[PDB]
Amino acid sequence: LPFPYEFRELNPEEDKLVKANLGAFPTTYVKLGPKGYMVYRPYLKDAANIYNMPLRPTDVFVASYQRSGTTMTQELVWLIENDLNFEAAKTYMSLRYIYLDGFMIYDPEKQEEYNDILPNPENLDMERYLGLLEYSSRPGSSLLAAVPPTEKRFVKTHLPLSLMPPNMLDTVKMVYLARDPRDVAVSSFHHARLLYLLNKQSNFKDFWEMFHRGLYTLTPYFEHVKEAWAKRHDPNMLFLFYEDYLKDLPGCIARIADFLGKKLSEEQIQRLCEHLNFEKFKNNGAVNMEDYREIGILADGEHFIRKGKAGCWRDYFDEEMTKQAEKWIKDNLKDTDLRYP
Ligand SMILES: Nc1ncnc2c1ncn2[C@@H]1O[C@H](COP(=O)(O)O)[C@@H](OP(=O)(O)O)[C@H]1O
Ligand SMILES: CC1=C(/C=C/C(C)=C/C=C/C(C)=C\CO)C(C)(C)CCC1
Ligand SMILES: [Ca+2]
Numbered sequence: 001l002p003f004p005y006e007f008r009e010l011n012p013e014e015d016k017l018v019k020a021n022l023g024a025f026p027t028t029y030v031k032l033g034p035k036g037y038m039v040y041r042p043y044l045k046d047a048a049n050i051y052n053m054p055l056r057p058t059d060v061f062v063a064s065y066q067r068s069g070t071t072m073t074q075e076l077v078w079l080i081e082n083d084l085n086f087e088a089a090k091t092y093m094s095l096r097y098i099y100l101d102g103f104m105i106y107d108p109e110k111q112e113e114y115n116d117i118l119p120n121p122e123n124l125d126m127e128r129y130l131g132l133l134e135y136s137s138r139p140g141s142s143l144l145a146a147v148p149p150t151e152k153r154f155v156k157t158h159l160p161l162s163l164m165p166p167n168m169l170d171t172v173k174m175v176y177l178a179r180d181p182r183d184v185a186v187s188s189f190h191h192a193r194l195l196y197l198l199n200k201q202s203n204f205k206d207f208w209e210m211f212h213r214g215l216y217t218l219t220p221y222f223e224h225v226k227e228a229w230a231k232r233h234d235p236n237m238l239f240l241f242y243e244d245y246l247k248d249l250p251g252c253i254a255r256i257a258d259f260l261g262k263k264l265s266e267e268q269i270q271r272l273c274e275h276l277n278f279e280k281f282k283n284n285g286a287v288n289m290e291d292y293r294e295i296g297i298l299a300d301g302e303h304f305i306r307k308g309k310a311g312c313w314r315d316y317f318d319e320e321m322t323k324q325a326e327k328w329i330k331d332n333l334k335d336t337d338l339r340y341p
Contacts, residue, residue: 001051001052002048003047003048003051004051005032005033005034005047005163006033007030007031007032007033007039007044008030008031008036009030010029010030010031010215014215017209017210017213017215018210018215020199020202020206020210021192021198021199021202021206021207021210021216022192022197022198022199023199024117024198024199024200025117025196025197025198026107026110026113026114026117027040027041027042027104027105027106027107027110028040028041029041029215029217030043030044032044032047032163033162033163035160035162035220035223036214036220037160037162037163037218037219037220037223037224038214038215038216038217038218038219039104039217039218040104040105040107040217041104041107042103042104042105042106042107043101043103043104045139046103046104046139046140046141047163049139049140049141050100050101050139050140050141050159050163050164051163051164051165052165053140053141053144053145053164053165054145055165055168055171055172056149056153056171056172057171057172058152058153059152059153059155059171059172059173060077060081060152060153060154060155060172060173060174060175060260061155061156061157061172061173061174061175062074062077062097062154062155062156062157062174062175062177063157063158063159063161063174063175063176063177063228064158064176064177064178065158065178065179065184065218065219065221065224065225066158066184066188066191066217066218067179067184067187067188067191068177068178068179068184068242069177069179069240069242069245070156070158070177071093071281071287071304071305072245072276072281073175073177073240073256074093074096074097074154074156074287075089075093075275075276075281075287076253076256076272076276077154077175077256077260078096078097078154079272079275080253080256080257080260080262080264080272081152081154081260081262084264084268084271084272086275089286090286091286092286092287092291093286093287093289094289096154097154097155097156098140098143098144098147098153098154098155098156099140099156099157100140100143100144100155100156100157100159101140101157101158101159101218102136102140102156103136103137103138103139103140105136105217106133106136106137108133108137111133114133115129117196118196118296118297119196120296123296124295124296124297125294125295125296128294128295129295129296129297132295132297140157158217158218159218160218160223160224160227160228161227161228161231162227169231169234169236169237170236172236173236173237173238173259173260174228174236174237174238175238175240175256175259176228176237176238176239176240177240177241177242178225178228178229178239178240178241178242178340179241179242179243180242180243180310180311180313180340181211181212181221181222181325181328181329182313182317182325182329183242183310183311183312183313184221185204185207185208185211185212185313185316186204186312186313186316187306188207188211188216189204189207189208189316190302190306191302191304192207193299193302194298194299194302194303194304195297195298195299196297196299204316205318205321208316208317208321208325212324212325212328222332225338226332226336226338229336229338238255238256238259240252240255241340241341242310243310243340243341244341246308246309246310247341249273249276250269250270250273253269253272253273254269257269278305278308281305281308282303282305282306282308287305288303288304288305289304290303290304
């Protein structure tokens with residue numbers, strides 16, 4: 001099948017704002033498709049393959065706009081399918097799942113320019129850093145197609161449905177997570193700091209201006225969410241809210257199990273709840289990506305697992321931003337049944 005989408009460079013306005021947040025970063029963006037989803041330029045080379053990637057009936061996807069609960073979900077989804085074999089779940093998350101669109105943030109043609117954004121390049125564990133770059137060159141598709149049939153595939157992605165095989169849900173199951181845009185904005189701001197993506201200069205307002213305006217990775221934020229929303233009625237789609245994980249974890253697990261075709265006992269659902277305790281998770285080496293810190297590519301004072309709180313966007317928004325945020329979220333939920341807890 002051919003890729004039904006074209007792309008356009010950013011116009012002056014758009015580009016001006018973006019460079020005000022990610023100027024220092026080597027990878028540039030491009031608007032893909034009619035909705036103009038923001039994708040790192042490299043994505044283009046594999047775009048068509050992903051659109052046509054061969055799916056398998058046993059494939060399980062954990063999708064979401066980034067920073068909405070992907071990690072928590074992957075861990076639960078993995079345990080449930082592998083009969084709560086906590087022992088075997090101790091291997092790195094990035095090894096148990098395939099991050100479909102995780103490659104695009106790296107542009108090989110710019111290797112040199114990358115370490116320059118690191119406070120200290122002379123202190124990198126080169127044997128590892130370089131290996132990271134290599135893996136990060138392998139297109140998403142290739143990594144999926146490499147897994148033999150006798151191995152269940154666990155895919156992770158922040159790609160909207162429109163960029164993946166349409167009708168895919170006829171073959172694979174997916175769990176899409178969503179979270180309050182505002183809290184997502186915040187978490188993303190810090191995550192971008194974690195990997196040295198933002199000009200050490202700019203602040204959060206700048207980031208937010210870029211975010212709700214559809215100029216950040218994989219946004220427009222609402223089109224992304226709405227796409228999965230419209231498919232929640234499907235038997236292979238499970239739409240969840242990050243807020244509910246905090247409100248009723250025991251009940252969220254139940255739903256997932258029921259969804260993935262399992263039956264956990266009060267004990268299993270409970271046994272999983274303790275395993276997902278924030279502090280216990282935040283310190284879990286298999287899922288906190290802290291191994292990366294050894295490499296030398298994580299910012300001091302940042303962590304892949306931060307607070308795990310809800311509604312703390314209020315500590316970052318000023319009255320001005322707050323109004324503009326309300327109007328924005330208000331305007332995208334008009335004439336749609338999409339509602340956040
Ligand atoms: N076990 C857990 N329980 C609650 N929140 C968790 C969690 N593990 C990670 N998180 C939170 O989930 C967000 C990451 O989302 P994702 O995995 O999709 O990128 C972060 O939000 P915060 O930045 O608000 O802390 C992170 O701290
Ligand atoms: C390879 C590579 C990098 C690291 C990418 C990482 C660490 C990705 C994992 C991201 C996650 C897990 C969050 C989204 O779900 C950085 C940007 C340093 C610069 C250059 C090459
Ligand atoms: Ca350098």
